[PDB]
Design a protein around this ligand. Structure first.
Ligand SMILES: Cc1ncc(COP(=O)(O)O)c(C/N=C2\CONC2=O)c1O
Ligand SMILES: Cc1ncc(COP(=O)(O)O)c(C/N=C2\CONC2=O)c1O
Ligand SMILES: Cc1ncc(COP(=O)(O)O)c(C/N=C2\CONC2=O)c1O
Ligand SMILES: Cc1ncc(COP(=O)(O)O)c(C/N=C2\CONC2=O)c1O
Ligand SMILES: [K+]
Ligand SMILES: [K+]
Ligand SMILES: [K+]
Ligand SMILES: [K+]
Ligand code: NA
Ligand code: NA
Ligand code: NA
Ligand code: NA
Lengths: 431, 431, 431, 431
């Protein structure tokens, strides 16, 4: 049992608490779309862990490559190259759109965003960074400074030159023009104010294609194209953080492929390492060349380490060969329709949004007031778990609590149905 | 051969350059204290890669544990605990000095420093951070803001409230009192100026016990105790970054054990993961408790992931069982004496310093002017490599180029001698 | 003649240029509503100089008091009090609304805003300052940081924690709700974004009742009350800068009297000194008391100097006795109707706004496109001058050039008519 | 009597407290080197008020010019020139050293420093400002950011890029080289640390030739020349604030004339206006030209107002004609010798320093420990006043309380002797 009192005593005495609460169970093993507790109870992992287990837990091919390299090529001095690094950088150039040529292989999501923000700053000679008011880019300095969905209070000033604009949120619109939510006029209005505040040092805009932590908010039609133009007109780079959207989760290899808008710098992480710490930035030859001339520096302990790179290479291979990107659309369709049926059944489901296998379900009191259903969100989450379904709700100011659903791309038809099943029971048991 | 033209073509076309130059060889395998090129030539790794391969490359026990977990427990949702995390946190509490009780398990060195700086800020309600003018804490925001040995230009303002004081450097003293280098009076003088500048928001002092990037500068007798008092008197936390000194490299488990001065927050990384991305902060129960009450947040993708934690646990086990800490003293003694013999032989060796298996050799023109030997440092480094010896020189303003020597704790008597041998030839071939 | 070549040679060789251009004439004397050139030509001063000559130039009573004190009590050590200082502070308490009790007597407008911003910061323990995107508070540090109508580029970062929100501008509305310009919803939307960006250190909102430099933009009905509530709800002080609106110009002693909303800190300057350097902040007994306990400091060379204070006292006396505040309404009405007749005559006049003797006339191409009439504004200004009428146009981004009309409160019916006359000719001569 | 209870009641109810305490007397008139209370008691003004009454109080010629202009030319629109402005700018060019050509005429000391700091920033494209740790430049934003003798706590962060270095203080030396206070090596050491911290944006160094608020600390022989070289080598402008030293007080017209080191920008204020609010910056034609091309802006209400300018012109005339600069040396010599005799008499006088009529007397417990004489300083100041002598002591961290003596340049032999007399009695009455 999950109750090993020595265990919980040690957890309590020697762990730093870092946000949230610890689930009251001890996870002993993981395989495919499931995690197992100390009792042996299978818990269906509908979040792919911290949204990273793209191939589910302990994928045989992943296990193999890790082994293969653990005992062959592990970690190196950062000036030394090896085959997996060059292979992975080459693959990344080949599968991203034209205009993205060169890669930097790192360890975490925040790290990737920091390296990108640092390069933008260097290359432009400027320093002001603009993000969305509901963003999530990481916990480290610059990454945190561009993060507005949370973490801004009680920890000192933010980086000098930080600005946010409101993200286009079709569910709860707030900017109108002629009895219509004009998200493009909102965007124009947002930039006007930025322009007035700027000290004349706008360097970059950083954005997630779909704001995950912010509540599964998809940038609507024409937006990204509009945003890139605002940047271009101002001499700003556009940095696209696809930590959650990259590597096939939304139905395209990269979310940016859907709009056909290619960013100046693309950052990847979570999905790319398949549970392991691996991340990257991909930029154009022109930008890298200039950064170089200018003395760009981002030298860390694990930059270009062979083991993680070799894992990333295998992840890409499997995704391509097994057509997991298409799979994402087919399974997402099945999952989405299921959620729509629940929404038919239950009045507390106010919205079902997202794309491919990055879906959001917003819980509400009144499907008309769209009044946030406080409390409800958490009982649901609670019953889900009892029922054997791991869910994650995010609760932000002014909107209803949002369930972030993101199962492995290797998820089965059956697992999807099990999830829908459990979720339905959790809801009815909760009201 | 190392000349695979497809290889180098791809490196050139698809890699972002991040500082330094790429060594012109392709590393194919690694084992023990050696790395092997495409020709099969063994290169003796006197830097333990990027100073992380504590047990050398591809250590059998490391290989085993990694396997064991790759296929059993890999990556999890950050609210879920598992045995390796609790075991590792518990072990860390047990081997660090009294006053360090609770741990946070992360991925990189900069990340660990960021989490520590963020906690200090939260817990004090303040935000000014003081570091050494020759420090190296990482490339991310806060960590970079506290980094003065390099990286400060062309990338925008630093974090608000950043200050540096000079580090005590006995080789090139600059503060006297009665014809004597009084490093404690220097420290007093340094703080006086800080006091005058501060806005009244001093939160923490961050320091490396031995400044590695800064040139293997060991804080001298009584200093740390003196520094901790300056902090205490000001309501500041002392954060000790043992990324390079921790886990037995200096001859004690933690460098802080040598002085008997225990920091408020201790950060670890490099050595702890043995090539893999794992890092941590260890703080006192009191500080963690307050951070908690205050809402401390540092939630990342891989915080508390089982695989890396399980690796860290094994590293600690092996180090303890095989008495690698003592080994560090015995091998360091042998290595140090060798360097002193070279210094007898060659006039260009101006100083041999450091502790245990973290040694520095400062190259000079004139052992009296102590004039930096420019050029010389790099030919040497160059001949070393030809000779089959991987070395790392750091070149900072006002001092002679420094070789940073830090072989695996598993290094053999023979490997040490080989290194001394090659280094002697490299020198004579270089002048 | 205005052509003294020695004069212009010296101007050119020894004057620092500080914005704008120097009018090509030499002003020799000034009296009442007129300035006279070297030829003796009278120029009607429709801006009261730099909007400060409330009683016109060289008012006999002003001349008398200045004399009276020049030779009696001039300048003192800042710890020494005198009668004019106490009298003036007492008068200010008596004529401002209830809740404003204590005064600080300074020298310039920016200085007054700095002293107020510094007190807000002290008293709240916070530091973020919010202003309007079209504001003008001064050229010095904090005052400039809160200034968005201009001056923000090429001079380094602004003060940490500076934010702006859009000012409610009824002429060119940009925020709608149900086919209506909802300036209160705009205000709500503005604050929401602020809230998301703030580091949790909001100290004050600083505002002009009528944005003068920004284009004579009057805060519309209910706005100020709404703004004060936003502040209150956030623990922020409201600082009202009446440099241009105070001391009867708008038809009330203080513009804030019109809305019946009393600020936490009121700042005055321009009008108060009647050409001379005198300014002030007025705050509540509670706020002063706390600032005091906290060690508030704003010690300058001329704080509490008797001469300027004695001038300020006389200005208040004359304004009260001669009923210049009412006069402002009667003359403003006459002036306003005149401008409306011109607007009937000329299509280029798009708007006539403002209050009392602080009026604005916005020049446009098309009274429907409301397209800014570039060029036109400046010819007009140019012909005015030839014609003997001193005008001031302000040209800001996205709106038509604005003439800022603000004659002395002592202006005569005849002078008003002369002004209207000349202005009409200037216009027809200009198109 | 000074006891008018209505008076003190109003002071208490309606004055904002701004530092220090109000002297318990009501000053009714002032003339020459004296101020008179409500009882008619003459108080000898040994500080020239707030160190501004260069010609003493209510100087007949000053009274005349003020009158002359009050009723002739008072205040103007800032784009309009007049004779006094051009005359004063021309005179300033003529009496300052070669290399200072163009002037900007403002209102206060802080304002002048702000305009200078803003121009340096513009012209260099940079923003970091370096000052002395014991400086005093004013209460407004930038000026306050460069002020380290006080005011830095409880009011939020300082301007981004603020640094201080220690000022050379021969009385209490703290940097040695070979048993000698090497203030030049101290300077070298100071800059080294700056260099390491800078983000590569050093714009200017701002300094007082003699730190007045800091304790009458005269920059010693060769220092300024050394400082200017440090600046030059770094592409930094040197701004010299002669608010207290300018216009003959030290025995030369400008203190900078003594060392023969001409600054890039010179700022003046206090003395220049002779009690009235007038200040200025003087820079080179080259710097003004560039600032101009770059769009320099510093447009205020009273910039270039004729009245104050006309006063400044007269002050310069009188100083020149009556040879007040030489007078400063002769009277300063007499005053200095007197203080040295007191120091012979009393053990509590530890040092007598300064130059011309800007003298400092440091009070100590032990003329050997040089232990600050707390309490003593204030009784003395207290008895002085009873005795009829207005003195000002400044008390800073680590040094003994300092009396700042600075009588009018028009002071008589007799007044000097009276002062010495009273001061001697005050001392003996105090111990
Ligand atoms: C003392 C110290 N702290 C923190 C770090 C940052 O660790 P990272 O996040 O890069 O993994 C480094 C890295 N030391 C490096 C990094 O590159 N070269 C060095 O000598 C370090 O030496
Ligand atoms: C869009 C996005 N970018 C960057 C990151 C940072 O990656 P890290 O450095 O933490 O590995 C996150 C993390 N997303 C998280 C982190 O915790 N919960 C989330 O939903 C993210 O969602
Ligand atoms: C060197 C110096 N510069 C600038 C200023 C600022 O002038 P303000 O704007 O205050 O007119 C001061 C004021 N010195 C003061 C101010 O109060 N007490 C002093 O000893 C000063 O001593
Ligand atoms: C609303 C407002 N506040 C403060 C100030 C600053 O006063 P200063 O320190 O310049 O005496 C100004 C100056 N208004 C100006 C200054 O120049 N042109 C204007 O229309 C102002 O309009
Ligand atoms: K590496
Ligand atoms: K995790
Ligand atoms: K005063
Ligand atoms: K003016
Ligand atoms: Na590509
Ligand atoms: Na411990
Ligand atoms: Na009142
Ligand atoms: Na000159």
């Amino acid at each position: 049992l999950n109750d090993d009192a020595t265990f919980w005593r040690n957890a309590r005495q020697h762990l730093v608490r870092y946000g949230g609460t610890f689930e009251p169970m001890i996870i002993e093993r993981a395989k495919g779309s499931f995690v197992y507790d100390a009792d042996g109870r299978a818990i269906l992992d509908f979040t792919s862990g911290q949204m990273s287990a793209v191939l589910g837990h302990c994928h045989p091919e992943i296990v193999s490559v890790i082994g293969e390299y653990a005992g062959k090529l592990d970690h190196l001095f950062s000036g030394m190259l090896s085959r997996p690094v060059v292979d992975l950088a080459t693959r990344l150039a080949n599968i991203t759109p034209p205009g993205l040529d060169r890669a930097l292989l790192l360890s975490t999501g925040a790290e990737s965003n920091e390296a990108a923000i640092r390069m933008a700053k260097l290359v432009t000679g400027k320093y002001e960074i603009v993000g969305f008011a509901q963003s999530w880019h990481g916990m480290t300095g610059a990454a945190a400074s561009a993060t507005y969905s949370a973490g801004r209070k009680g920890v000192g000033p933010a980086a000098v030159g930080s600005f946010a604009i409101p993200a286009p949120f079709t569910y709860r619109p707030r900017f109108e023009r002629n009895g219509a939510y004009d998200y493009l006029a909102e965007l124009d209005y947002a930039f006007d104010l930025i322009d007035r505040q700027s000290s004349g040092n706008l360097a970059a805009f950083i954005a997630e294609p779909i704001l995950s932590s912010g509540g599964i908010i998809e940038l609507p039609d024409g937006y990204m194209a509009a945003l890139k133009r605002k940047c271009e007109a101002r001499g700003m780079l556009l940095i696209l953080d696809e930590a959650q959207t990259g590597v096939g989760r939304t139905g395209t290899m990269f979310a940016c492929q859907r709009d056909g808008v290619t960013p100046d710098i693309l950052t990847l992480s979570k999905t790319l390492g398949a549970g392991l710490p691996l991340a990257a930035i991909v930029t154009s030859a022109a930008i890298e060349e200039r950064a170089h001339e200018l003395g760009y520096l981002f030298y860390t302990t694990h930059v270009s380490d062979p083991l993680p790179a070799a894992v990333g290479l295998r992840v890409l291979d499997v995704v391509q060969r097994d057509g997991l990107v298409a799979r994402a659309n087919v399974m997402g369709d099945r999952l989405r329709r299921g959620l729509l049926d629940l929404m038919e059944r239950f009045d507390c489901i106010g919205d079902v949004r997202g794309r491919g296998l990055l879906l959001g379900v917003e819980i509400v009191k009144d499907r008309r007031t769209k009044e946030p259903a406080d409390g409800l969100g958490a009982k649901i989450t609670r019953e889900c778990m009892n029922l054997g379904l791991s869910m994650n709700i995010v609760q932000l100011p002014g909107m209803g609590g949002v369930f972030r659903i993101a199962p492995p791309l290797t998820v089965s038809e059956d697992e999807i149905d099990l999830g829908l099943s459990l979720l339905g029971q959790a809801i009815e048991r909760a009201l």
